[PDB]
């Protein structure tokens, strides 16, 4: 089954093969990884704002075709809502899209793979890894 | 068939019967309305951070039972990505979750029902109504 | 996935490689384009009424081979019906087949690609591009 | 299975039970009838343009719930295209949406039920009935 | 289900719309017609030997896409074998591919549609029609 | 998997154990051989026209039981059509049923096993063996 | 359906419009071409090793969208194995990936399109064309 | 369920029960092993070049019947392409077929089982084992 949910920069590092450690671990974990549709949103944004949008979209779409994209559903939303309230009580900052990504992963029991572990470690009941 | 996607404040107004015109129009359009899972997320956050979480969580279950909750999917994400880039080019500010709700509705050709018309009208190719 | 719905003249320009700019953008967007079955209908009519139906029909099969043809479904019909009433209220003229593909495109969140932007910009909640 | 494709006016007569002969034959043919999505478009248009749109939409949507709606597909488009060229050669005028419905029916071997048989009889290879 | 199996000349007549009576009845019998793959072979042969092979192939492949093609299977083989022996006893000549087409149709209880009734009427236990 | 497609005479040689070399190589290749349904047709004809049809039909059922019978499908038909045109250009004679199994074999990458290599060698892109 | 399997250089030529004769014939045969995944591999290698990988990867995604990619399967492997042994006996050199696409094509009865007819003509039971 | 992709020599070692350790470990890992169709190709080549091909083909096919054969697909091709470019950049030599089954295994997150670990360890992001 699925074990990891990859955040946006981990995806970009993989595509770029830099830092090389990310693609290395990515490939060792083939068949076990996914991204949130929220992360897809961020990836598309990155392509759309770039100098060569059509080119970069094609590269992203190819990458995305080989990994699973999970829809952000009611369970994901529910966990995100809980997490934002837990974080607010504790006074811990997490960015809005990261909050959603954290909730999505937690709702499915997935490990978040991220180079922003400082932020994601603030979340309760969630495992994180950094492959960079 | 779905015609309207309700923004968070419109849902809250419906729940509170204030402004009462919102629930009135809500009732008139029963069976034609939905919310993004992004809006559900915002509703759960609001309940979870409130003085009476269980009471407000129960109220949300009642509201949600009367409408469809749509998963934020790849199409929603893609439109959101496009929109964020379009807005940034124009120097137009829209909040992160509203961007996602805007992208979700546009991907399905739905009318956004919102009292935050100034923000959502900045998005291209999107119809809005305000029931409040 | 799909981003653009091409109207008949844009299809014809692509086939003829004139204006060459159309085929250029067509090639750049390979894999992201479709036509409504309504537009297919118009293309088939064009071939059938031509001096050389078998030749022109064959050219259409080849062209259609490179894109998706979307069935005009209940969602497309529903949006079209709504658009026709909106347009009638405002006194804005749009041709019957154009109304239908406007509704088709809007129901799927697709951009209409057309050299008839004056007509299609009259439709609410719809984006267009002109590649010619 | 399906034998009849109903025109817009036949649907309306059925709903209104006037002329009573239409609903009579309609019910005698339960399970054998459908409409084109093109006809759905016209029904929605009628409701959307009316004095009480939400009301009339509900009435139409309820009626449609009890009959099959066929998507206007590539075969329908092909027959429509052929028919428009045949009609044009003969100089026989048929309305744009009627052309598509004629094509849709012919592509499926269905009998067109219409009170506008004067128009539909101009089409080749198509059976028609009038229940009014 | 299937009622008719169309022989090669009938298919060509339909495509050419000449004699017009063939396409007329073809259109009236939509959904009820098929061809044997043996007939497909003859059509492909016709295109392949023509001056414009690619064009005529597109034309045939286009025609064939809207009708069912049946594989010549063991039951078709069996009836063909019986028929060839029955014919030889009677001194009644039928061409090699017509023998197979006859056997295929008979094995499925289908009516052969052909303008070559002289050959096909020699076969026992088989219905034929000529639409030309 | 399947490697060989046997023509009619080879099947008969196998059944009759004469020339004995054929059944010998047949037994060595058990599980790797098939016949076209076209060849099945020829075998049934031979039995049906013989002095003792029931006996010979029973012998065929036993033989056919040891091998796969392949349906003559659209790919087989298509290859046969190309082949028939190519042979006609070169002025090379191949019998009608031989053309079909040659086409059938080529569409599947099968080796035709035949003692009629003179005819089958005329076909392009086709390998043959003679076990007799 | 499929008739041609394009070797790597033919694909590259089509992409570059050089020699222009390749794209010229390519366009004439739209809907009838495929590549082996073995060829996809070589294309991806070519892109990845180039000065501008992302640009060239995007171009490959576009090209691949216009044709079928066939998986190199057991039948393809079997033929390739046979061919490698046939070639070694005759002392005929064919490059390793060429052997595989030859086997892939022969297993499906496809015409190999290549500018390396010297190598591919060494293979038995395989038709080739050179469009360059 | 699958964990291991077996290289050609490991399959041969298993068949020969020499070295005995390979079959020992093979049996301990029943239900968890597969081969690439590329390896099937090599096994078939070995049988075909042998002095008793029919015999050795039967032994291999029997062996292959008890393990999964994976088709070499687009994902496999993609990984192989990345790998070939990386190896060339690093100046690490790996044989053509080895490159393909390395990419195939890597695309599926499988452990390559091989007695050629020196070559396969040059590939990035790939686990290897030697059971010999």
PDB file of N, CA and C in Angstrom, chain G residues 37-38 40-42 44-45 48-49 69-82 84-85 88-89 96-97 99-100, chain H residues 37-38 40-42 44-45 48-49 61 69-78 80-82 84-85 88-89 96-97 99-100:
ATOM      1  N   UNK G  37       7.836   0.222 -26.407  1.00  0.00           N
ATOM      2  CA  UNK G  37       8.389   0.874 -25.224  1.00  0.00           C
ATOM      3  C   UNK G  37       9.926   0.867 -25.277  1.00  0.00           C
ATOM      4  N   UNK G  38      10.515  -0.070 -26.021  1.00  0.00           N
ATOM      5  CA  UNK G  38      11.973  -0.099 -26.192  1.00  0.00           C
ATOM      6  C   UNK G  38      12.425   1.191 -26.870  1.00  0.00           C
ATOM      7  N   UNK G  40      10.623   4.055 -26.781  1.00  0.00           N
ATOM      8  CA  UNK G  40      10.372   5.115 -25.802  1.00  0.00           C
ATOM      9  C   UNK G  40      11.595   5.273 -24.891  1.00  0.00           C
ATOM     10  N   UNK G  41      12.142   4.129 -24.466  1.00  0.00           N
ATOM     11  CA  UNK G  41      13.342   4.137 -23.642  1.00  0.00           C
ATOM     12  C   UNK G  41      14.466   4.923 -24.311  1.00  0.00           C
ATOM     13  N   UNK G  42      14.727   4.642 -25.586  1.00  0.00           N
ATOM     14  CA  UNK G  42      15.822   5.304 -26.286  1.00  0.00           C
ATOM     15  C   UNK G  42      15.538   6.794 -26.418  1.00  0.00           C
ATOM     16  N   UNK G  44      13.760   8.650 -24.333  1.00  0.00           N
ATOM     17  CA  UNK G  44      13.951   9.253 -23.016  1.00  0.00           C
ATOM     18  C   UNK G  44      15.451   9.412 -22.689  1.00  0.00           C
ATOM     19  N   UNK G  45      16.251   8.394 -23.005  1.00  0.00           N
ATOM     20  CA  UNK G  45      17.713   8.483 -22.885  1.00  0.00           C
ATOM     21  C   UNK G  45      18.251   9.684 -23.655  1.00  0.00           C
ATOM     22  N   UNK G  48      17.232  12.843 -21.764  1.00  0.00           N
ATOM     23  CA  UNK G  48      17.909  12.975 -20.484  1.00  0.00           C
ATOM     24  C   UNK G  48      19.396  13.325 -20.627  1.00  0.00           C
ATOM     25  N   UNK G  49      20.035  12.891 -21.713  1.00  0.00           N
ATOM     26  CA  UNK G  49      21.473  13.128 -21.871  1.00  0.00           C
ATOM     27  C   UNK G  49      21.773  14.427 -22.611  1.00  0.00           C
ATOM     28  N   UNK G  69       1.950   3.647 -27.585  1.00  0.00           N
ATOM     29  CA  UNK G  69       3.153   2.982 -27.087  1.00  0.00           C
ATOM     30  C   UNK G  69       2.791   1.546 -26.699  1.00  0.00           C
ATOM     31  N   UNK G  70       3.425   0.566 -27.339  1.00  0.00           N
ATOM     32  CA  UNK G  70       3.156  -0.850 -27.040  1.00  0.00           C
ATOM     33  C   UNK G  70       4.140  -1.406 -26.009  1.00  0.00           C
ATOM     34  N   UNK G  71       3.630  -2.064 -24.963  1.00  0.00           N
ATOM     35  CA  UNK G  71       4.503  -2.706 -23.975  1.00  0.00           C
ATOM     36  C   UNK G  71       5.254  -3.880 -24.594  1.00  0.00           C
ATOM     37  N   UNK G  72       6.535  -3.997 -24.272  1.00  0.00           N
ATOM     38  CA  UNK G  72       7.332  -5.121 -24.745  1.00  0.00           C
ATOM     39  C   UNK G  72       6.975  -6.368 -23.921  1.00  0.00           C
ATOM     40  N   UNK G  73       6.185  -7.252 -24.520  1.00  0.00           N
ATOM     41  CA  UNK G  73       5.565  -8.331 -23.773  1.00  0.00           C
ATOM     42  C   UNK G  73       6.202  -9.697 -24.054  1.00  0.00           C
ATOM     43  N   UNK G  74       5.547 -10.765 -23.596  1.00  0.00           N
ATOM     44  CA  UNK G  74       6.110 -12.098 -23.722  1.00  0.00           C
ATOM     45  C   UNK G  74       6.239 -12.519 -25.178  1.00  0.00           C
ATOM     46  N   UNK G  75       5.255 -12.158 -26.004  1.00  0.00           N
ATOM     47  CA  UNK G  75       5.311 -12.508 -27.413  1.00  0.00           C
ATOM     48  C   UNK G  75       6.468 -11.784 -28.076  1.00  0.00           C
ATOM     49  N   UNK G  76       6.613 -10.499 -27.749  1.00  0.00           N
ATOM     50  CA  UNK G  76       7.716  -9.703 -28.265  1.00  0.00           C
ATOM     51  C   UNK G  76       9.076 -10.308 -27.865  1.00  0.00           C
ATOM     52  N   UNK G  77       9.204 -10.688 -26.597  1.00  0.00           N
ATOM     53  CA  UNK G  77      10.433 -11.310 -26.084  1.00  0.00           C
ATOM     54  C   UNK G  77      10.758 -12.623 -26.798  1.00  0.00           C
ATOM     55  N   UNK G  78       9.719 -13.420 -27.027  1.00  0.00           N
ATOM     56  CA  UNK G  78       9.873 -14.737 -27.632  1.00  0.00           C
ATOM     57  C   UNK G  78      10.402 -14.597 -29.038  1.00  0.00           C
ATOM     58  N   UNK G  79       9.788 -13.700 -29.798  1.00  0.00           N
ATOM     59  CA  UNK G  79      10.255 -13.462 -31.153  1.00  0.00           C
ATOM     60  C   UNK G  79      11.685 -12.955 -31.176  1.00  0.00           C
ATOM     61  N   UNK G  80      11.997 -12.044 -30.261  1.00  0.00           N
ATOM     62  CA  UNK G  80      13.335 -11.472 -30.175  1.00  0.00           C
ATOM     63  C   UNK G  80      14.340 -12.574 -29.879  1.00  0.00           C
ATOM     64  N   UNK G  81      13.987 -13.454 -28.943  1.00  0.00           N
ATOM     65  CA  UNK G  81      14.838 -14.585 -28.610  1.00  0.00           C
ATOM     66  C   UNK G  81      15.090 -15.468 -29.821  1.00  0.00           C
ATOM     67  N   UNK G  82      14.026 -15.731 -30.580  1.00  0.00           N
ATOM     68  CA  UNK G  82      14.125 -16.533 -31.795  1.00  0.00           C
ATOM     69  C   UNK G  82      15.050 -15.838 -32.771  1.00  0.00           C
ATOM     70  N   UNK G  84      17.369 -13.490 -32.286  1.00  0.00           N
ATOM     71  CA  UNK G  84      18.781 -13.425 -31.891  1.00  0.00           C
ATOM     72  C   UNK G  84      19.508 -14.710 -32.242  1.00  0.00           C
ATOM     73  N   UNK G  85      18.828 -15.835 -32.054  1.00  0.00           N
ATOM     74  CA  UNK G  85      19.400 -17.127 -32.407  1.00  0.00           C
ATOM     75  C   UNK G  85      19.513 -17.320 -33.923  1.00  0.00           C
ATOM     76  N   UNK G  88      22.462 -15.123 -35.090  1.00  0.00           N
ATOM     77  CA  UNK G  88      23.763 -15.620 -34.672  1.00  0.00           C
ATOM     78  C   UNK G  88      24.212 -16.776 -35.567  1.00  0.00           C
ATOM     79  N   UNK G  89      23.271 -17.634 -35.964  1.00  0.00           N
ATOM     80  CA  UNK G  89      23.580 -18.742 -36.872  1.00  0.00           C
ATOM     81  C   UNK G  89      24.056 -18.238 -38.224  1.00  0.00           C
ATOM     82  N   UNK G  96      21.415  -4.505 -30.173  1.00  0.00           N
ATOM     83  CA  UNK G  96      20.549  -5.148 -29.167  1.00  0.00           C
ATOM     84  C   UNK G  96      19.117  -4.591 -29.122  1.00  0.00           C
ATOM     85  N   UNK G  97      18.955  -3.270 -29.117  1.00  0.00           N
ATOM     86  CA  UNK G  97      17.617  -2.702 -29.042  1.00  0.00           C
ATOM     87  C   UNK G  97      16.869  -2.886 -30.367  1.00  0.00           C
ATOM     88  N   UNK G  99      17.144  -5.524 -32.282  1.00  0.00           N
ATOM     89  CA  UNK G  99      16.665  -6.894 -32.208  1.00  0.00           C
ATOM     90  C   UNK G  99      15.335  -6.953 -31.488  1.00  0.00           C
ATOM     91  N   UNK G 100      15.235  -6.223 -30.388  1.00  0.00           N
ATOM     92  CA  UNK G 100      14.022  -6.230 -29.598  1.00  0.00           C
ATOM     93  C   UNK G 100      12.839  -5.583 -30.316  1.00  0.00           C
TER      94      UNK G 100
ATOM     95  N   UNK H  37      10.056  -9.252 -18.904  1.00  0.00           N
ATOM     96  CA  UNK H  37       9.965  -9.874 -20.226  1.00  0.00           C
ATOM     97  C   UNK H  37      11.325  -9.818 -20.935  1.00  0.00           C
ATOM     98  N   UNK H  38      12.166  -8.869 -20.543  1.00  0.00           N
ATOM     99  CA  UNK H  38      13.516  -8.783 -21.111  1.00  0.00           C
ATOM    100  C   UNK H  38      14.325 -10.026 -20.737  1.00  0.00           C
ATOM    101  N   UNK H  40      12.910 -12.903 -19.964  1.00  0.00           N
ATOM    102  CA  UNK H  40      12.271 -13.969 -20.738  1.00  0.00           C
ATOM    103  C   UNK H  40      12.912 -14.063 -22.109  1.00  0.00           C
ATOM    104  N   UNK H  41      13.141 -12.905 -22.705  1.00  0.00           N
ATOM    105  CA  UNK H  41      13.802 -12.848 -23.984  1.00  0.00           C
ATOM    106  C   UNK H  41      15.142 -13.572 -23.923  1.00  0.00           C
ATOM    107  N   UNK H  42      15.918 -13.318 -22.875  1.00  0.00           N
ATOM    108  CA  UNK H  42      17.235 -13.937 -22.773  1.00  0.00           C
ATOM    109  C   UNK H  42      17.119 -15.456 -22.577  1.00  0.00           C
ATOM    110  N   UNK H  44      14.642 -17.380 -23.641  1.00  0.00           N
ATOM    111  CA  UNK H  44      14.239 -17.918 -24.941  1.00  0.00           C
ATOM    112  C   UNK H  44      15.430 -17.956 -25.889  1.00  0.00           C
ATOM    113  N   UNK H  45      16.237 -16.897 -25.904  1.00  0.00           N
ATOM    114  CA  UNK H  45      17.452 -16.909 -26.720  1.00  0.00           C
ATOM    115  C   UNK H  45      18.337 -18.120 -26.406  1.00  0.00           C
ATOM    116  N   UNK H  48      16.757 -21.268 -27.774  1.00  0.00           N
ATOM    117  CA  UNK H  48      16.780 -21.261 -29.238  1.00  0.00           C
ATOM    118  C   UNK H  48      18.158 -21.529 -29.810  1.00  0.00           C
ATOM    119  N   UNK H  49      19.207 -21.151 -29.092  1.00  0.00           N
ATOM    120  CA  UNK H  49      20.541 -21.333 -29.635  1.00  0.00           C
ATOM    121  C   UNK H  49      21.067 -22.708 -29.246  1.00  0.00           C
ATOM    122  N   UNK H  61       9.526 -22.629 -20.462  1.00  0.00           N
ATOM    123  CA  UNK H  61       8.132 -22.226 -20.417  1.00  0.00           C
ATOM    124  C   UNK H  61       7.440 -22.806 -19.180  1.00  0.00           C
ATOM    125  N   UNK H  69       5.584 -12.866 -15.177  1.00  0.00           N
ATOM    126  CA  UNK H  69       6.369 -12.125 -16.160  1.00  0.00           C
ATOM    127  C   UNK H  69       5.772 -10.727 -16.273  1.00  0.00           C
ATOM    128  N   UNK H  70       6.576  -9.700 -16.021  1.00  0.00           N
ATOM    129  CA  UNK H  70       6.078  -8.339 -16.126  1.00  0.00           C
ATOM    130  C   UNK H  70       6.372  -7.804 -17.505  1.00  0.00           C
ATOM    131  N   UNK H  71       5.391  -7.170 -18.130  1.00  0.00           N
ATOM    132  CA  UNK H  71       5.653  -6.487 -19.388  1.00  0.00           C
ATOM    133  C   UNK H  71       6.575  -5.287 -19.184  1.00  0.00           C
ATOM    134  N   UNK H  72       7.530  -5.124 -20.089  1.00  0.00           N
ATOM    135  CA  UNK H  72       8.401  -3.954 -20.058  1.00  0.00           C
ATOM    136  C   UNK H  72       7.589  -2.785 -20.621  1.00  0.00           C
ATOM    137  N   UNK H  73       7.151  -1.893 -19.736  1.00  0.00           N
ATOM    138  CA  UNK H  73       6.184  -0.847 -20.085  1.00  0.00           C
ATOM    139  C   UNK H  73       6.777   0.570 -20.112  1.00  0.00           C
ATOM    140  N   UNK H  74       5.912   1.580 -20.202  1.00  0.00           N
ATOM    141  CA  UNK H  74       6.384   2.964 -20.324  1.00  0.00           C
ATOM    142  C   UNK H  74       7.173   3.404 -19.085  1.00  0.00           C
ATOM    143  N   UNK H  75       6.723   2.996 -17.902  1.00  0.00           N
ATOM    144  CA  UNK H  75       7.428   3.348 -16.670  1.00  0.00           C
ATOM    145  C   UNK H  75       8.817   2.696 -16.643  1.00  0.00           C
ATOM    146  N   UNK H  76       8.879   1.442 -17.075  1.00  0.00           N
ATOM    147  CA  UNK H  76      10.154   0.746 -17.159  1.00  0.00           C
ATOM    148  C   UNK H  76      11.086   1.475 -18.132  1.00  0.00           C
ATOM    149  N   UNK H  77      10.549   1.835 -19.300  1.00  0.00           N
ATOM    150  CA  UNK H  77      11.313   2.526 -20.331  1.00  0.00           C
ATOM    151  C   UNK H  77      11.831   3.839 -19.788  1.00  0.00           C
ATOM    152  N   UNK H  78      10.976   4.554 -19.054  1.00  0.00           N
ATOM    153  CA  UNK H  78      11.344   5.852 -18.518  1.00  0.00           C
ATOM    154  C   UNK H  78      12.513   5.737 -17.542  1.00  0.00           C
ATOM    155  N   UNK H  80      14.679   3.292 -17.351  1.00  0.00           N
ATOM    156  CA  UNK H  80      15.868   2.843 -18.057  1.00  0.00           C
ATOM    157  C   UNK H  80      16.545   4.047 -18.735  1.00  0.00           C
ATOM    158  N   UNK H  81      15.745   4.909 -19.354  1.00  0.00           N
ATOM    159  CA  UNK H  81      16.258   6.106 -19.999  1.00  0.00           C
ATOM    160  C   UNK H  81      17.006   7.017 -19.042  1.00  0.00           C
ATOM    161  N   UNK H  82      16.432   7.231 -17.865  1.00  0.00           N
ATOM    162  CA  UNK H  82      17.105   8.025 -16.848  1.00  0.00           C
ATOM    163  C   UNK H  82      18.419   7.356 -16.457  1.00  0.00           C
ATOM    164  N   UNK H  84      20.303   5.137 -18.137  1.00  0.00           N
ATOM    165  CA  UNK H  84      21.341   5.184 -19.180  1.00  0.00           C
ATOM    166  C   UNK H  84      22.039   6.526 -19.227  1.00  0.00           C
ATOM    167  N   UNK H  85      21.274   7.599 -19.063  1.00  0.00           N
ATOM    168  CA  UNK H  85      21.868   8.927 -19.082  1.00  0.00           C
ATOM    169  C   UNK H  85      22.769   9.147 -17.871  1.00  0.00           C
ATOM    170  N   UNK H  88      26.016   7.095 -18.194  1.00  0.00           N
ATOM    171  CA  UNK H  88      26.910   7.689 -19.197  1.00  0.00           C
ATOM    172  C   UNK H  88      27.613   8.916 -18.629  1.00  0.00           C
ATOM    173  N   UNK H  89      26.861   9.698 -17.866  1.00  0.00           N
ATOM    174  CA  UNK H  89      27.373  10.883 -17.216  1.00  0.00           C
ATOM    175  C   UNK H  89      28.468  10.505 -16.215  1.00  0.00           C
ATOM    176  N   UNK H  96      23.308  -3.593 -22.219  1.00  0.00           N
ATOM    177  CA  UNK H  96      22.026  -3.094 -22.725  1.00  0.00           C
ATOM    178  C   UNK H  96      20.830  -3.751 -22.070  1.00  0.00           C
ATOM    179  N   UNK H  97      20.818  -5.079 -22.011  1.00  0.00           N
ATOM    180  CA  UNK H  97      19.665  -5.759 -21.439  1.00  0.00           C
ATOM    181  C   UNK H  97      19.633  -5.584 -19.931  1.00  0.00           C
ATOM    182  N   UNK H  99      20.633  -2.926 -18.342  1.00  0.00           N
ATOM    183  CA  UNK H  99      20.093  -1.593 -18.148  1.00  0.00           C
ATOM    184  C   UNK H  99      18.582  -1.623 -18.128  1.00  0.00           C
ATOM    185  N   UNK H 100      17.989  -2.373 -19.049  1.00  0.00           N
ATOM    186  CA  UNK H 100      16.533  -2.459 -19.136  1.00  0.00           C
ATOM    187  C   UNK H 100      15.912  -3.166 -17.936  1.00  0.00           C
TER     188      UNK H 100
END
